[PDB]
Design a protein around this nucleic acid. Structure first.
Ligand code: K
Ligand code: K
Ligand code: K
Ligand code: K
Ligand code: K
Ligand code: K
Ligand code: K
Ligand code: K
Ligand code: K
Ligand code: K
Ligand code: K
Ligand code: K
Ligand code: K
Ligand code: K
Ligand code: K
Ligand code: K
Ligand code: K
Ligand code: MG
Ligand code: MG
Ligand code: MG
Ligand code: MG
Ligand code: MG
Ligand code: MG
Ligand code: MG
Ligand code: MG
Ligand code: MG
Ligand code: MG
Ligand code: MG
Ligand code: MG
Ligand code: MG
Ligand code: MG
Ligand code: MG
Ligand code: MG
Ligand code: MG
Ligand code: MG
Ligand code: MG
Ligand code: MG
Ligand code: MG
Ligand code: MG
Ligand code: MG
Ligand code: MG
Ligand code: MG
Ligand code: MG
Ligand code: MG
Ligand code: MG
Ligand code: MG
Ligand code: MG
Ligand code: MG
Ligand code: MG
Ligand code: MG
Ligand code: MG
Ligand code: MG
Ligand code: MG
Ligand code: MG
Ligand code: MG
Ligand code: MG
Ligand code: MG
Ligand code: MG
Ligand code: MG
Ligand code: MG
Ligand code: MG
Ligand code: MG
Ligand code: MG
Ligand code: MG
Ligand code: MG
Ligand code: MG
Ligand code: MG
Ligand code: MG
Ligand code: MG
Ligand code: MG
Lengths: 93, 45, 6, 271, 6, 6, 6, 6
RNA sequence: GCUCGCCGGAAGACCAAGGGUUCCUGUCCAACGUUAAUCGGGGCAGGGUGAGUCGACCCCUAAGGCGAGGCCGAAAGGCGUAGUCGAUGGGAAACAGGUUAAUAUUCCUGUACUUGGUGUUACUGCGAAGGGGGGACGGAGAAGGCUAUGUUGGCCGGGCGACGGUUGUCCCGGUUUAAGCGUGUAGGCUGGUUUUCCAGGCAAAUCCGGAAAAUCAAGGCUGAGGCGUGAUGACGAGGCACUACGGUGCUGAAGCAACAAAUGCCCUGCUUCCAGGAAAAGCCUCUAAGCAUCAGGUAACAUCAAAUCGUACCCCAAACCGACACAGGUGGUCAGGUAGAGAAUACCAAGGCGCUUGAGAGAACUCGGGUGAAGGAACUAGGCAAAAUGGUGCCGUAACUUCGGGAGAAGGCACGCUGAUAUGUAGGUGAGGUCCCUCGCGGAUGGAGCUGAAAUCAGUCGAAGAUACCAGCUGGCUGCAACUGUUUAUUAAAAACACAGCACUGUGCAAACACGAAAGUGGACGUAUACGGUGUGACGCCUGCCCGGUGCCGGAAGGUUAAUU
RNA sequence: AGGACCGAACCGACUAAUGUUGAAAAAUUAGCGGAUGACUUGUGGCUGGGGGUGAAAGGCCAAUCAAACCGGGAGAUAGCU
């Protein structure tokens, strides 16, 4: 049991890409941007509660932010956590 | 030819890092001087 | 989980 | 046996080995092992305080029983062993109660020989008694200087002390140095000489053999510059000064003993 | 006494 | 933890 | 082999 | 070339 | 795209360190790129790093660091006890196949394994901050057994040849398959089993150590590989069907044997030597106080858990260290073919590259090379440089010598190919069969097949058979230093330093001595056969005279002499 | 067996040429020495400036060494240019 207030903060956005699209069509895996301090257990709990789908497993990685220049002034985008959430077979988001 | 700078992050941090500076009064004086000068980077850390 | 403040 | 190597290489020509066939070929007794700490002759300031120390072979420390305080209980010598930590060999002894210890191996003592410590032990080599109970004129080793402290004198290979006199609370000892010294008669000593007397007949034969023993090269003062040593300097081989240590103390005859505390115990200096 | 054990 | 150096 | 041929 | 010497 | 060239113990591949998006895709060519650039490690945008098992974190310690109290020090601080950190070391577990533009032992498929928590069932002496065991250790060498791997045959599929020949003793390609689970083999180690008892292991112990009996003659521990299963699978030459000419989807033969064979594995072994070769935890075992129809242990089953962080990419380099897209530097791993002793060397494979200015021309001169008439060191400070020698087998080999050497001294002869002996020998390996069989991973015989030196004889080609690459010049006299080493990073490698050996000298242990206002620490967990200092410098023969001077050692009657009074 | 021998890796640096506003603030090329040891190398640790460390060259201590570097006394002083 994680508190719902916590679960309502952990999922930030669906990650849109060719790889994410292929993940959903081939492997029944949604790709999410999640809070940087989100654990696999919290992401699982949140997806099952909020999307109302059975989660099989969560795989996670931290995307390191890119160094970029805006008018010859150097900056760095933020690191963010990606979750590959594999839904149980036949759940279908 | 082998040049003088042979980087090791462990040795860097042990030699010159924040905690090495904080360990002695003279190291804390380095940090005091660098804060007073307004350095963006206090240490190698 | 939330130690940040929740 | 003292064995000369054949000159099949120039580093072997002069080698003279002391080969003792009786020493245990196997590993030492693991419960009596500890690690050594190689220093490089550096102290806790990290400074070289004794020059010419470094490298050489890794060595485990054998806990040797110098106190010989397990009185009354006979022990049997199981085996003689090589000890890298000292010139003497050591003997693994088994007490009749099942305790094993190492002792310094006396001259003559072999596997199967019986030893015993205490006031009532027999006067025979390897036995330890208070020097009160050892006959005057006896040859002894591993001699304590304070009662119960453990043997400090005559521990090196082939060494021994003669008990020359007994007067009251003190015995007088002739040490290997030639010094006549008083020790309390309650101090223990082991009868006989320390074994491995052939130790001194070894010839290392090559530079590397000293390196194996953790001895680094001695650089002569006269080979240096004045900044480094009093002897340093000169265009060609020059000297022209009284020989001194690196720290400028005369090193050819000048006496350095200064211990008024222990002067009382010295009957006659080695001279 | 001494880091070796004493 | 200790006379060995711990 | 062996420089003798082998 | 070896075993034989070389 | 075709051809050509170059690397191939690398100029290939995978990493650590270090870097940090350089990765992939699209787009752009100002600047950056030593030229142009449509290209880029450049600009811009988007994408991309998926783990119970890999690593980190984590448990454990080494050197060493910090260090409550403490000891010490004007202050700052120094040292250090309990502790607590600290890997470069010890400690659980995953493999093959498939897949993305870009990740994969992480995704998918298939098949596994480890540790822990709960719950249940059965049986139960549990219990540590303590004891013991274990972990747990060197160098060298040798040999056997293996595998990786290669080669050949067999098998299967395809081929019948741009120019003479090519249905064959012909050509090309493929012939792959893991962890895990089961089995226990070559090899290695050790006597087993019970009983009684005990000045040891701080207490205790049923454990370990010790002692004495009885009794059996075998048990036990360890272990590569092989074999079986995993696998009716996967993969698979190729063919077919699609093709947005990049590639998709489908279908799929054989898939064996012999021989050779590691530097890898058995092997933390074995043998041998002296210079005598971490620690601590996990782990196993023993009990203590305590718990005592429980807790807890044990096993079985079920069930849940295994988080977090790293994971892109470069990595002998254009991405790291060198200001550069810099001929420099940078630790580990992998190790194909032919020839070869070889990881040398030549040529190749897989794979990777042609080094980010080109085009002409064919002067001097410079650089790097090739050849040279006659002469042959006349050159020059000096044979500097060059030329030369260069392999294997056998024969042969001087002074001198410390008897090892000198020595590869010197010098010489043979060397390719073909046939025969013998269509392939000696040797190695070893099938089926046949015969005993603790009826098996066994022994005995057996030689098919495979591999394969060497010799001799006889032929034969060339100017030349160690044909290339590769690969000692040799001898004589003499100075110095015994020798192998070491050194002026970047003008000196030596005769200098060191060295074994020698001598003098100090040092009795709270050693002398050294680092320290000190505490302490080194010397040394050493103890005069030891340790420090000094000089000399293997070995051989030796090492003479001088103690007046300067030191040092001993003496101390007397002279002189400080504070003090 | 060996501070044994020949010889790659590996460690070194004897000779020559080149290079000397270099490809390189010490290299390249051809030769050269060691190559089981007093060997070599990775990671980490310790020693600190009249101090260290030195098989000793005043060598080395971050391209700096008969006294490192940085900051300060500091505008030292300069009968000299
Ligand atoms: K010397
Ligand atoms: K001199
Ligand atoms: K110096
Ligand atoms: K001199
Ligand atoms: K000189
Ligand atoms: K151009
Ligand atoms: K993990
Ligand atoms: K962690
Ligand atoms: K043809
Ligand atoms: K495995
Ligand atoms: K198997
Ligand atoms: K990866
Ligand atoms: K790396
Ligand atoms: K000569
Ligand atoms: K030299
Ligand atoms: K005199
Ligand atoms: K200084
Ligand atoms: Mg998963
Ligand atoms: Mg992850
Ligand atoms: Mg010395
Ligand atoms: Mg010894
Ligand atoms: Mg010692
Ligand atoms: Mg000497
Ligand atoms: Mg000099
Ligand atoms: Mg002087
Ligand atoms: Mg002179
Ligand atoms: Mg003179
Ligand atoms: Mg960028
Ligand atoms: Mg790219
Ligand atoms: Mg341009
Ligand atoms: Mg780019
Ligand atoms: Mg401390
Ligand atoms: Mg720890
Ligand atoms: Mg580690
Ligand atoms: Mg990749
Ligand atoms: Mg095989
Ligand atoms: Mg034709
Ligand atoms: Mg080898
Ligand atoms: Mg990768
Ligand atoms: Mg370039
Ligand atoms: Mg480069
Ligand atoms: Mg290298
Ligand atoms: Mg090569
Ligand atoms: Mg020309
Ligand atoms: Mg020529
Ligand atoms: Mg000519
Ligand atoms: Mg001619
Ligand atoms: Mg001639
Ligand atoms: Mg001439
Ligand atoms: Mg002339
Ligand atoms: Mg020459
Ligand atoms: Mg030449
Ligand atoms: Mg002369
Ligand atoms: Mg010499
Ligand atoms: Mg030499
Ligand atoms: Mg130089
Ligand atoms: Mg030179
Ligand atoms: Mg002491
Ligand atoms: Mg000399
Ligand atoms: Mg004389
Ligand atoms: Mg050698
Ligand atoms: Mg050098
Ligand atoms: Mg060279
Ligand atoms: Mg040589
Ligand atoms: Mg060699
Ligand atoms: Mg000089
Ligand atoms: Mg320098
Ligand atoms: Mg000065
Ligand atoms: Mg002033
Ligand atoms: Mg001024």
């Amino acid at each position: 049991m994680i508190r719902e207030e916590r679960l309502l903060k952990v999922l930030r956005a669906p990650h849109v890409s060719e790889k994410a699209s292929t993940a959903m069509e081939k492997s029944n895996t949604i790709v999410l941007k999640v809070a940087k301090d989100a654990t696999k257990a919290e992401i699982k709990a949140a997806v099952q509660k909020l999307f109302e789908v059975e989660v099989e497993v969560v795989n996670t990685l931290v995307v390191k932010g890119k160094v970029k220049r805006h008018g010859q002034r150097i900056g760095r985008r933020s690191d963010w956590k990606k979750a590959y959430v594999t839904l149980k077979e036949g759940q279908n988001l | 030819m082998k040049r003088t700078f042979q980087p090791s992050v462990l040795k860097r941090n042990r030699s010159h890092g924040f905690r090495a500076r904080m360990a002695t009064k003279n190291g804390r004086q380095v940090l005091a001087r660098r804060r007073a000068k307004g350095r963006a980077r206090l240490t190698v850390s | 989980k939330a130690x940040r403040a929740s | 046996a003292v064995v000369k190597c054949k000159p099949t290489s120039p580093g072997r020509r002069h080698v003279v080995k002391v080969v003792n066939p009786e020493l245990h070929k196997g590993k030492p007794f693991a419960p009596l092992l500890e690690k050594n700490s190689k220093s490089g002759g550096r102290n806790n300031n990290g400074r070289i305080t004794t020059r010419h120390i470094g490298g050489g072979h890794k060595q485990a420390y054998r806990i040797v029983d110098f106190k010989r305080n397990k009185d009354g209980i006979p022990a049997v010598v199981e085996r003689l062993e090589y000890d890298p930590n000292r010139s003497a060999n050591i003997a693994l002894v088994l007490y009749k109660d099942g305790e094993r210890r190492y002792i310094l191996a006396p001259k003559g003592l072999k596997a199967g020989d019986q030893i015993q410590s205490g006031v009532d032990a027999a006067i025979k080599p390897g036995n330890t008694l208070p020097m009160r109970n050892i006959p005057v004129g006896s040859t002894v080793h591993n001699v304590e200087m304070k009662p119960g402290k453990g043997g400090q004198l005559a521990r090196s290979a082939g060494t021994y002390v003669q008990i020359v006199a007994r007067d009251g609370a003190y015995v007088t000892l002739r040490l290997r140095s030639g010094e006549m010294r008083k020790v309390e008669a309650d101090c223990r000593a082991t009868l006989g000489e320390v074994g491995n007397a052939e130790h001194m007949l070894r010839v290392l034969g090559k530079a590397g053999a000293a390196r194996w023993r953790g001895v680094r090269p001695t650089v002569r003062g006269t080979a240096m510059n004045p900044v480094d040593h009093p002897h340093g300097g000169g265009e060609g081989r020059n000297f022209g000064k009284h020989p001194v240590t690196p720290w400028g103390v005369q090193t050819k005859g000048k006496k350095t003993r200064s211990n008024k505390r222990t002067d009382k115990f010295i009957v006659r200096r080695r001279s």
